């Protein structure tokens with residue numbers, strides 16, 4: 001499953017913005033390992049069409065764990081600097097002060113996300129995955145490694 005994983009970024013400064021080195025075709029994996037700090041309110045993993053900041057680049061897949069109250073994961077898409085319809089997942093595996101491994105698997109019609117070896121959620125494509133060339137990681141999170149399996 002991770003036998004083809006190639007980690008290429010270690011302990012990046014957050015915020016991290018980096019070009020994805022290949023097209024996110026079906027079967028592609030994005031693997032992100034790190035920690036949630038004790039004071040974390042939220043962090044996000046954004047799969048972006050480009051790295052523009054002004055105006056803000058479209059986010060095909062916003063994967064946004066939030067830790068207040070019982071915690072959740074918000075997923076959404078940003079187009080023309082505007083958010084679409086939120087898909088909220090309340091069964092979240094993330095915890096402050098806990099390590100994690102996020103595996104984002106890119107499928108034909110959706111993303112399938114597993115955390116710590118366990119399925120977490122699905123997100124149907126709203127932007128064609130071929131337009132995704134940039135990985136952004138923002139917020140209160142510590143990242144040990146970013147890798148890809150194409």
Ligand SMILES: CC(=O)N[C@@H]1[C@@H](O)[C@H](O[C@@H]2O[C@H](CO)[C@H](O)[C@H](O)[C@H]2O)[C@@H](CO)O[C@H]1O
Pocket residue numbers: 062064074075076083086
């Ligand atoms: C229950 C609900 O709809 N809450 C919404 C927030 O999640 C949302 O925050 C926004 O949610 C976005 C994803 O949907 C991003 O995470 C962004 O950082 C964050 O500010 C705001 C602004 O769109 O609207 C509230 O009504």
Ligand code: NA
Pocket residue numbers: none
């Ligand atoms: Na945001």
Ligand code: NI
Pocket residue numbers: 035144
């Ligand atoms: Ni550590």
